[PDB]
């Protein structure tokens, strides 16, 4: 009830040849759906939380009943992260404008940022996410475990900041095409990171 | 150096039709190799710890420095776990003998244990392992995150006990064949869990 699997900005094959259509379909119809379903299941008993946007719910995980924290952290996190991820994917964009300049300001150069992002994405051990976040006035690359989001805050996720964009580095995001070669997937991410959406999120939050 | 990739006890396709040969090859030659490589790299500056069997090293994670604990927990963990995993996989075995009796004693029935194992393997959120462990004289089903091992102890891994067998539920262990259908993979594991080795391990620290 509370959450719905969001309508994608695109068909499953829209990120070809970079992100494989089989994975995008499963990622949405199976993995994301499951996060929505399991978050919804957990929120049935929590009407005072079920109304929150998922992105707000995950900032309030410390307010949930103890026995709800993990399931919603994982599944509302998964829902939030995947919802962001899809909107954060698009071919044909160019990093530009204020976001490019902020990246250049905060990382020294786009290449420095990319290397830092790639390093975070590659070094995330196990499942998780690499993020470009905005922490007040400064962009940062952080990473989170599993479906943790920086929106969850430091205490829960070990990261914080508003996610400008993120890269799913769960193996389900890349295994079918890339298998263990997560760096290749990370490189491909640069071809599909939706800088227009990242720029819009930066514009909203900067 | 410190660690080597062990030979598989079997050919890449020896677990077919249950576990796919492609995954077995990548899982062994890439993922396990990488754990070996990265554990070896981290041990290069740790002479005090570099000569230890991997299963002993992962019991001493709390003794290494902080810039080494995680890398070795993850990679020596991965090496320990995959080493066990390969030996713990074999077609044609039959659960029997003291191990079957102890499973029946501690879980009520083989099916009860299998259901509890499957639950633990399915509910492991993110990457990790499901374990049959022996805790003193009681078999238990536990799961660990990432490449944590029960051998690592409760503080680090959230689990303890002597692993009798384990199931890798990292998505790289099953995604190529099963994609998101980890329960199908978990069910297939019953066809390839090496009960002989599980029995041998059970007899070894019973
Ligand atoms: Mn995902
Ligand atoms: Mn594995």
Swiss-Prot record, chains A, B:
Q: Which residues bind Mn(2+)?
A: 27, 82, 168, 172
Alphabetically list the UniProt keywords: Manganese, Metal-binding, Oxidoreductase
**What GO biological process terms does the UniProt entry carry, in alphabetical order?**
removal of superoxide radicals
The protein's GO terms of the molecular function aspect are: metal ion binding; superoxide dismutase activity
Annotated cofactor note: Binds 1 Mn(2+) ion per subunit.
Names of required cofactors:
Mn(2+)
Matching Gene3D superfamilies: Fe,Mn superoxide dismutase (SOD) domain (1.10.287.990), Iron/manganese superoxide dismutase, C-terminal domain (3.55.40.20)
InterPro entries from the xrefs?
A: Mn/Fe_SOD, Mn/Fe_SOD_BS, Mn/Fe_SOD_C, Mn/Fe_SOD_N, Mn/Fe_SOD_N_sf, SOD_C_sf
Q: What is catalysed by this protein?
A: 2 superoxide + 2 H(+) = H2O2 + O2
| One Gene Ontology cellular component annotation held by this UniProt entry | cytoplasm
Q: What is its EC number?
A: 1.15.1.1
Q: What does this protein do?
A: Destroys superoxide anion radicals which are normally produced within the cells and which are toxic to biological systems.
User: Member of which family?
Assistant: Belongs to the iron/manganese superoxide dismutase family.
Q: How does it assemble?
A: Homodimer.
The name under which this protein is listed is Superoxide dismutase [Mn]
Lineage, top ranks? Bacteria, Pseudomonadati, Pseudomonadota, Gammaproteobacteria, Enterobacterales
